[PDB]
Structure 1
Amino acid sequence: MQPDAINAPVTCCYNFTNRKISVQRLASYRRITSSKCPKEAVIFKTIVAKEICADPKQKWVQDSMDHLDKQT
């Protein structure tokens, strides 16, 4: 068990949505920090609980994270 963490699976984004998603449709997000993934990416979780990959290089993404951060 001990070091087996080094071998766990990693969740990554390979395809991104190109359509901006209204911030009231979004519930929360997580930014991909594993270096194993091919690219920078944000996984938004929508109000209905589906997860969608977005590109943090696009402005709407950055704003959305900022909105979600102040939201309790």
Structure 2
Amino acid sequence: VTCCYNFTNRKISVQRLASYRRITSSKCPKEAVIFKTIVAKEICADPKQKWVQDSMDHLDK
């Protein structure tokens, strides 16, 4: 339903994150991953960036 128009550039520490989900819809222009922080606000992140892919790995484990 929702699209990421602007990304968080810097890496947030894994501890500050909570949950994660991807976005691959045709409606949205750029590919994106949406992390949910402890304080229950969602954050847009670029998957073309190792720090995001590593954050996804940690959440899986």
TM-score bucket of the superposed structures, by smaller chain: over 0.9
Measured in 1, the distance between the counterparts of 2:24 and 2:32 equals 9
How many residue pairs get aligned? The number is: 61
Structural RMSD (CA)? 0.7
Q: Where in structure 2 are there 5+ consecutive unaligned residues?
A: none
Please give the per-residue CA displacement for 1:1-39, whole angstroms capped at 9, x wherever unaligned: xxxxxxxxx201010011110001000111002121101
Q: Structure 1 vs Structure 2: percent identity of aligned residues?
A: 100
Higher strand share: 2
Q: Which of 31, 35, 40 is matched with 2:31 structurally?
A: 40
Q: TM-score with structure 2 length normalisation?
A: 0.94
Q: Where in structure 1 are there 5+ consecutive unaligned residues?
A: 1-9
Secondary structure at 1:62 match in 2: helix
Q: Which runs of 4+ in 1 moved over 3 A?
A: none
Q: TM-score with structure 1 length normalisation?
A: 0.80
